[PDB]
Amino acid sequence: MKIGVIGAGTMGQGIAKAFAQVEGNTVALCDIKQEWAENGLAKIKKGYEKLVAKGKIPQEKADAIVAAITPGLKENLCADCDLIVEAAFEDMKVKQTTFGELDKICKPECIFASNTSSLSITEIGKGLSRPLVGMHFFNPADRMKLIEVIAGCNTPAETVEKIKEISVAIGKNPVQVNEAAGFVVNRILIPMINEAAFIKMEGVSDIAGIDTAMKLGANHPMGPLELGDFIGLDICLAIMDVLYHETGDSKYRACPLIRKMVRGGNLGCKTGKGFYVYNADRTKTPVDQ
Amino acid sequence: MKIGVIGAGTMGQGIAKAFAQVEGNTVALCDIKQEWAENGLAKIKKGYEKLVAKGKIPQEKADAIVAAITPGLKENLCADCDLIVEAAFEDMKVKQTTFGELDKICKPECIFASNTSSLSITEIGKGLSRPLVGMHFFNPADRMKLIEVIAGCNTPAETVEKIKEISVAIGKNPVQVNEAAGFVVNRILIPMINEAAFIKMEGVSDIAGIDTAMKLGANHPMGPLELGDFIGLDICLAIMDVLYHETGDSKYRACPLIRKMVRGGNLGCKTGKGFYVYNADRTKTPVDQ
Amino acid sequence: MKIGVIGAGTMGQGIAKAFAQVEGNTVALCDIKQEWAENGLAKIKKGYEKLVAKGKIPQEKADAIVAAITPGLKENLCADCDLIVEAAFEDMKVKQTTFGELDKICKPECIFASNTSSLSITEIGKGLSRPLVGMHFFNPADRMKLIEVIAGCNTPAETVEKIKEISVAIGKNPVQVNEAAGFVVNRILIPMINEAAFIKMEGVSDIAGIDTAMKLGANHPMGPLELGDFIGLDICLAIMDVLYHETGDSKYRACPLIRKMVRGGNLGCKTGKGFYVYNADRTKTPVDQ
Amino acid sequence: MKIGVIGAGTMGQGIAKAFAQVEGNTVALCDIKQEWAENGLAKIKKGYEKLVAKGKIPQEKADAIVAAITPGLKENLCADCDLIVEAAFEDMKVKQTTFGELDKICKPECIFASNTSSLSITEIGKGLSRPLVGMHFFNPADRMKLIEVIAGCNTPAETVEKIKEISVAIGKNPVQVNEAAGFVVNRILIPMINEAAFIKMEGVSDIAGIDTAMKLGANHPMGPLELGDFIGLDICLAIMDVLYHETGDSKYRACPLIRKMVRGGNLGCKTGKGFYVYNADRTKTPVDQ
Amino acid sequence: MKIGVIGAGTMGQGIAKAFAQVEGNTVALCDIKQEWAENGLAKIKKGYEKLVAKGKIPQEKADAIVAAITPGLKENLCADCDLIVEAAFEDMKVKQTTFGELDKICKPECIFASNTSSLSITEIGKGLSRPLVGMHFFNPADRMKLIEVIAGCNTPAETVEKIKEISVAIGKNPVQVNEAAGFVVNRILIPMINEAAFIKMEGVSDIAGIDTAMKLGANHPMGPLELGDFIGLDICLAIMDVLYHETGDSKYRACPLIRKMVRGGNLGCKTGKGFYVYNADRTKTPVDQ
Amino acid sequence: MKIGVIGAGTMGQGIAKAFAQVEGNTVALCDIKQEWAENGLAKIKKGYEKLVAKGKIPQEKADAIVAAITPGLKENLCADCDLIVEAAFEDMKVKQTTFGELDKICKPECIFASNTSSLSITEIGKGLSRPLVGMHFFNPADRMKLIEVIAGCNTPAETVEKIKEISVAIGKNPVQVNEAAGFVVNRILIPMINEAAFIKMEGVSDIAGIDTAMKLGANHPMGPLELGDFIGLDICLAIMDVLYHETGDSKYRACPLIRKMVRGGNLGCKTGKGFYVYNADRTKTPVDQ
Missing domain, CATH: 3.40.50.720 (NAD(P)-binding Rossmann-like Domain)
Structure with missing residues (x-):
């Protein structure tokens, strides 16, 4: 074909x-x-x-x-x-x-x-x-x-x-x-990343602590902050707003901390910085420290 | 010590x-x-x-x-x-x-x-x-x-x-x-599951579909519904209720379908039935079919 | 049988x-x-x-x-x-x-x-x-x-x-x-009354005009307020709290005005007074005037 | 005059x-x-x-x-x-x-x-x-x-x-x-229809069962989903979004099924299909079977 | 009399x-x-x-x-x-x-x-x-x-x-x-202090700077955090939880930072510690430092 | 400099x-x-x-x-x-x-x-x-x-x-x-005014009763309704909507009364009418009477 x-x-x-x-x-x-x-x-x-x-x-x-x-x-x-x-x-x-x-x-x-x-x-x-x-x-x-x-x-x-x-x-x-907003994967996964940004915004834990908790506790391949920097935080933020606008439910309201970073171009890997700084010399550091 | x-x-x-x-x-x-x-x-x-x-x-x-x-x-x-x-x-x-x-x-x-x-x-x-x-x-x-x-x-x-x-x-x-409700793991993890039950409940996809979509679309070791059966749908419902009472946020309201199933004693693995029937043959069937 | x-x-x-x-x-x-x-x-x-x-x-x-x-x-x-x-x-x-x-x-x-x-x-x-x-x-x-x-x-x-x-x-x-809270009729009928009570409480229209408007504009047998007095304002209030608690959704928050009335015993018909005073002489007067 | x-x-x-x-x-x-x-x-x-x-x-x-x-x-x-x-x-x-x-x-x-x-x-x-x-x-x-x-x-x-x-x-x-969004009638009548759509979408019961539940249990002259098609799902959808936007309350969030049906032009009587198929021989079959 | x-x-x-x-x-x-x-x-x-x-x-x-x-x-x-x-x-x-x-x-x-x-x-x-x-x-x-x-x-x-x-x-x-929950003064004054706790919990600013911003910006006698310590944070939490239950509106959900302090006996002036630690030598230090 | x-x-x-x-x-x-x-x-x-x-x-x-x-x-x-x-x-x-x-x-x-x-x-x-x-x-x-x-x-x-x-x-x-929506002063202060207008609208008290209950009850320099007219209600309506839009939280939904009034030119002191009529002979009268 x-x-x-x-x-x-x-x-x-x-x-x-x-x-x-x-x-x-x-x-x-x-x-x-x-x-x-x-x-x-x-x-x-x-x-x-x-x-x-x-x-x-x-x-x-x-x-x-x-x-x-x-x-x-x-x-x-x-x-x-x-x-x-x-x-x-x-x-x-x-x-x-x-x-x-x-x-x-x-x-x-x-x-x-x-x-x-x-x-x-x-x-x-x-x-x-x-x-x-x-x-x-x-x-x-x-x-x-x-x-x-x-x-x-x-x-x-x-x-x-x-x-x-x-x-x-x-x-x-x-x-x-x-047909429903975010189908299955996005609707489940992207709010995972949103919740992680809310947890960091509210002083519950740090960036690197949240990600090693999520991968040693849920045995996920990546932490949600990592993951969103890898998807692109402008992707994440856009998915959240679709969910919110399609449903009318505050349950899908985006973390203000994601909307701030995206406004600043701190989009993740593709811009060298989001929740982590990807150093010109290849490794990964959380903007916490 | x-x-x-x-x-x-x-x-x-x-x-x-x-x-x-x-x-x-x-x-x-x-x-x-x-x-x-x-x-x-x-x-x-x-x-x-x-x-x-x-x-x-x-x-x-x-x-x-x-x-x-x-x-x-x-x-x-x-x-x-x-x-x-x-x-x-x-x-x-x-x-x-x-x-x-x-x-x-x-x-x-x-x-x-x-x-x-x-x-x-x-x-x-x-x-x-x-x-x-x-x-x-x-x-x-x-x-x-x-x-x-x-x-x-x-x-x-x-x-x-x-x-x-x-x-x-x-x-x-x-x-x-x-100290905050859910700490890190449960606050992120159990609303995953809760969203999965909402998706089933709102007729978006089937139980087996949701589970294989989260492990293929996002490389998770288990599907969210599969995972609820294994933690205990009574644990999940409880963790969701703690989140909703601690915060007052409708965002953490529990899917009426998980309450329907916990009331029915269908808590997952440990009761032989849940989102999957744990058939005596030691396999596992989604209760969609 | x-x-x-x-x-x-x-x-x-x-x-x-x-x-x-x-x-x-x-x-x-x-x-x-x-x-x-x-x-x-x-x-x-x-x-x-x-x-x-x-x-x-x-x-x-x-x-x-x-x-x-x-x-x-x-x-x-x-x-x-x-x-x-x-x-x-x-x-x-x-x-x-x-x-x-x-x-x-x-x-x-x-x-x-x-x-x-x-x-x-x-x-x-x-x-x-x-x-x-x-x-x-x-x-x-x-x-x-x-x-x-x-x-x-x-x-x-x-x-x-x-x-x-x-x-x-x-x-x-x-x-x-x-099974789902309020099944079909209550989950539709009772929030009708509840929204009518907000219309009164937020000053949009008077009690007779809310009831007139609904049986004239919608060809309904009674007006929501009349219907609320006939069912029992304590029945309506209990049902709203069930809808709200089973779903954790503020969409079904009961109108404070109905809770005020149920607290004061003004339950509708069975107590001789609710949204209307039921005069022991057969007739029905709205407590607006 | x-x-x-x-x-x-x-x-x-x-x-x-x-x-x-x-x-x-x-x-x-x-x-x-x-x-x-x-x-x-x-x-x-x-x-x-x-x-x-x-x-x-x-x-x-x-x-x-x-x-x-x-x-x-x-x-x-x-x-x-x-x-x-x-x-x-x-x-x-x-x-x-x-x-x-x-x-x-x-x-x-x-x-x-x-x-x-x-x-x-x-x-x-x-x-x-x-x-x-x-x-x-x-x-x-x-x-x-x-x-x-x-x-x-x-x-x-x-x-x-x-x-x-x-x-x-x-x-x-x-x-x-x-003045207030939806005055008296639309603010009461159209969220009725909105809830009946949720009852369908959430699997609570079928289209014909919803409409006959509300014409027998409440003596209404038509079913809510019937009436949806009669009013025009595009019109119902528009009112539900004026209420939401004017109030900022997720209580008036439109049922996403109504919106999906509207996006596909299935508005009801004036297009020949909403929740029912309006057969070109004057019958009415719910899109449920 | x-x-x-x-x-x-x-x-x-x-x-x-x-x-x-x-x-x-x-x-x-x-x-x-x-x-x-x-x-x-x-x-x-x-x-x-x-x-x-x-x-x-x-x-x-x-x-x-x-x-x-x-x-x-x-x-x-x-x-x-x-x-x-x-x-x-x-x-x-x-x-x-x-x-x-x-x-x-x-x-x-x-x-x-x-x-x-x-x-x-x-x-x-x-x-x-x-x-x-x-x-x-x-x-x-x-x-x-x-x-x-x-x-x-x-x-x-x-x-x-x-x-x-x-x-x-x-x-x-x-x-x-x-009659309506919080009447007039509590309904307005207490969500102020609740908002001030959210600002602090979300990293927006420190305990002192919020209180000096509200007295230098609104010409208020005391800062909302100061004031909460004075009223007793156990009191402020009790009003919020009443507002929240009477209304069913998450708009009145209490800052989780207030419930944490109250569960710990940090009530303010009447316990020596709240948003500020009250020194037996008559002064007052924010718990920020 | x-x-x-x-x-x-x-x-x-x-x-x-x-x-x-x-x-x-x-x-x-x-x-x-x-x-x-x-x-x-x-x-x-x-x-x-x-x-x-x-x-x-x-x-x-x-x-x-x-x-x-x-x-x-x-x-x-x-x-x-x-x-x-x-x-x-x-x-x-x-x-x-x-x-x-x-x-x-x-x-x-x-x-x-x-x-x-x-x-x-x-x-x-x-x-x-x-x-x-x-x-x-x-x-x-x-x-x-x-x-x-x-x-x-x-x-x-x-x-x-x-x-x-x-x-x-x-x-x-x-x-x-x-950076967060409303910083400190406005994010606290404008929802006061907003809540004050919800009290008026829901028939809880009257304009001058509210404004005196706040400056006697909380020792504020002006009442919230007064302050609202003083700031300009268009500004207040605009800050309320930034908060709602920046958070997706209905906590910060504008009071319909204020939207009706701004949509009405009644902006306060700068239009000679808002919650009070600012008469030409210098005095001020609640539009309540």
Whole structure:
């Protein structure tokens, strides 16, 4: 099958990889600009020469993967595609027009899916001719094997089974989700990080104490403060506000301490500082000390 | 050093083991009737009998462990204990009373600690003539490496470090906590579970779906529902209620579904049913199907 | 079938007539003392003698209905009973002890049912040898057709339908409720009254205009304030506190104005005064003027 | 008197009917352009061309009613008007522009009233030369007999009574409301529907079981979910969010299921599906089976 | 007039003084037993000679005041009093019975007033056969000019005016409150101190800087933390928990930092430590340092 | 030192005089127009010329303060300044750009401060080359002695000291605040006013009774309703909404009464009506009567 992947950003690249990894699957990596298409494609090229050179990929397998992936922009490429997985800018009117255009571009049998974490799958596919489903990947999508199959108000049960079967065609475990804010993982995980920021804000414990408590007591792989610096605190803060706005419940109000840090650019690793300082010399120190 | 452990239930066994796995650590495992204490030791001798039969521990240390835990009842035992770790029934006047009795019994230098998870360390030692501090273990205490050190309103810093030093001396990391509901672990962990039951209850995903989504989407060792069954859905409901009463915050309201199930005696593993049925075949079925 | 109705107050009387109006049904009207049983049996006959007047039921049938209901208490009367509908004091460990006594008394096939509106079905049938179900009648039980069948956490499916069958056997429409505070009608009806009381207390409109507006703008049979006086303002207040405590949600916080009135004994109709003064001369005046 | 109604939709139509059914009442229907106004007058004509032919009204009147209604648009007809009843588009600043235009068009002693449900009466007529009062009709305006008179912060008691006076002059009962979100009826009626959605979403019972529980246990003329579809789920959703935003109280938080259904265009009767499917053969099947 | 004051603790002695200060007023200080009723009166004498000793009262007037106050227990002295002011334990069943005993003892025209700030005036006079009204004083009662006349549900307006007249007659300014939790002063003043504890608990600023910011910013006499130490943090916590329970609104949830200090006996000025440690050498240090 | 004040409005002049009152302090008062700037200085002269002829301050000192305030626009004037106090429109991008321009103009050592009460100090300096700090004055700035020093997420401790030191050197008392909504004064003070309006609205007391119960009961200089009119109710409504929005906590929901009143132009003293009508003949009357 042929798969069109809208958006050549970090999530788009990882989704292109997840399909190119298998077999006869072809990936049309479209974006706004062919420059931005091949940009993401050169990024896919770079990594996939590395795990060659570290005895982790043969080469005639690393090459056949970038070979199934053809970049470019849509319109050109998505007419024959079997499935669209859009991974563009988490913006309602973007996704709506993008899907309106592809609605006349793609063949009638193409399945429409979006990777959105924070927008209504149902609202995205309102005035359309074909069902719109949610196919939620987890970065890096080419390694992580969970798929949340988001069902919308009008998404037929068959459109769901098809995605679950495709997911099981590329190596993932699909979990069915009837549309609600934060689905399952975000709705549970992000408020974990929020609670940790409230615990630090109220002088209950320190940054490093909270994280070693959470990983030696719940045997988690990371502390929640660590984890949020790794997700990006602007991601965390945005998820909290979606939950809060979708529910009307103060239970999901964001820690003011997260909204302060994000206002200051202290977003975590990607900005060198959030709850920890990632030193130009590689290691990790809590801003407590 | 000598350690008196009040309560021969599951926690006092685990705590008595964590001490007795080391060196000059003698233990006095006490309960309300000596019979019940001699019971607790019998279950200790029991596993330690298997661990030797699995080559996993020499007998020569496993016997020197049990030989250092002496069963009996306080008055007759904790008189020269250097430290008291109370782990009895989660009731206020029970703990104000046994600590009040222990204030006359034990020598002026013995430290008073409580393993409570749901009561105020500050209120448990209101009448005492010495400080009272929290020493929060996690079952199984002998295997779990975390101890939350809880300073009450009047716990001196010198006592708090004497708990940090004792915890390093038995292989554990002390996190210091200023007394607040849930400390760190439970305040983050049990609202995870509570959100998982809300998700099931609001028809978002299924029990098996939620659990595999949290261990794949976030790499948690267990699913939240699976985890509730294993801590005890009565513990979870209680911890949630303590949070809601201590703070007055609707955020920590407990999912009516967990109360529905605790009222039904469906508390998880220890009652054969919970979010999963623990079928006699030693497998595990989600009660969705 | 033979039915045992526990409690001889307004509801137990009404439930007995609901069953004795039928056919091969006979009722055991029990309470604490036999004087208290046949007391409610006395009211039932006199009510039927009033019906024999009017032209509404012949004295042949009025006698036939009453010859089915036997006064007395359990222990003597409820051993071959097939169904037990309880309607006693809205208090948990009474219903638990009352059902605990009937556990030995009633025969093993006898379904245990409760009419409770505010207690957890699940909790009452906790210790019991046999399941517990909700059979929620609506005053007056002999005329109102609605029955909410409440499933508890452990109510088997077959029990729920043995109760939907019987409800049709006496001319009711069963609606299945999966236990949750206030089930369906109260959880909607009672917060209607409560919001009406806030409208008065926050000065939005007067008492007659709030009631006029709702039966004119919504074609409702009564206005919420009138309805609150008719139900009993102490019933409405207890129900709101149940909704609020079961959910921990301030959405169901009771209007202080209703609590003020219940504290002053102004409970509605049964005390001659609530939101309206019920003049002993038949008429109804709002305490606004 | 002569009344200027602005807006020729469902409300404008019914509002002018209620005025033109009386006596010396002449009405100036207006809208954006007269193609829009003559439009509404024509729908008024058709319904009146059926209420005669069924035998229920004679033509003489059903001719003189439409005779007193003159279609068109403002500026040329609502100068000598006495009472303005705006019913245009539920958006603030156009209402502010609309009223400020008539501020100079109309004669000074002309009363300004608005029919708004979700907008501040006080805010609409801020900078105006003259008071602005609420005159909340209920669809259909020609027969529903309730009218809510909305007092704003600066709405003199005199303007309010001259609105009650006019209201008893056309058969309706006026209820004075002092401004607050949802007045009396929506604030009580729409959270009803909101709670019924929660009862469905939370698995408490099914769609048809909810609606028949509230029409048998409470003698309501329709079920809450029925009524939801009848009102328009988009309208219900909008009111629930005016209450929340105006109060800041999570008590009026919209049920996320209502919102999901609205995002998919499933609004109820006017789209053929909300909680029921409105079969094109005049039946009604709940979307539950 | 003759005044019966029920209770000889801090408040009773304060109300007795505030009456006997006038002239033709005699007070009947009654409490549990006479040496407790005789305890206050000596306490009262102590101050008043100091009041002469520092020529702030002649002895002429400091002895005529102690002369007007006759101790002993009720029943003996209250058969003829014009006004009764209960100042006993803030316990509902005590209040109800002492007033109930008083209902036969006092004469038909004796007014019943209570000084309670935390209990329902409506409920306290529920059974009684004459109006119950609130007369709320502020410690110390003899110098503080404000009285809050609490009208209960069934408290007649005539009873409010005579309470208002008496107040003006003893040199107070009365403010009419229709019963609601915290009346007016506590409802405003105590959430201030609660907010100040949150600021400190959340790291916003230190204990001294908050208190100097509120007196230098709002020109307040004392800082909210200072003031809480003065009132007694056990008192401030009790008002919050009453506000929270009466209203059901988490808006009145008590700072957990206040419950921690109270559980530890750090109540403020009356224990030597609160937000400030009070040095026996007359100064005051924030626990921040 | 030299100080550039940005904004010639009521807050900018106070800040100009507070610095120029001292000595070697010189001041640059800048605005959008220079006819806007020396408008603010000319009023400074007018004010100082009124206190000259009250015999309260001598001319030669009035002259000496005015002679150190040079008006005009930035760009020209603030190039050599050593402190920047921004007091312009409370408008997020206005400041972000105004501060962006200044960052080029001023020397590398000029400290940057904003007198903003409701905006984030961290966001205002999101991408500047230098740190940005809070310097919160109180109208009237030249007379009020409190300054809250506001540290944003990235504000260096030393920068916070330079503001503490400068504050002490111009006579003020600096309270350090780690940026949170409402700082200390407002976050405490404005919810008082807010709660006062909820008492009025819920019919608990009346406007003048509340305002006297606070200044007699708590020995406050003004009542909360009075203070509200004095600050401006639009400001109060605006601070209440920042808190609600910054926390997601309904604790800080604005009273609907105040929203109705601001939506009504009734803002207090500055519109001649709010909770009191500020009559033209100097006196003040509660709108209650």
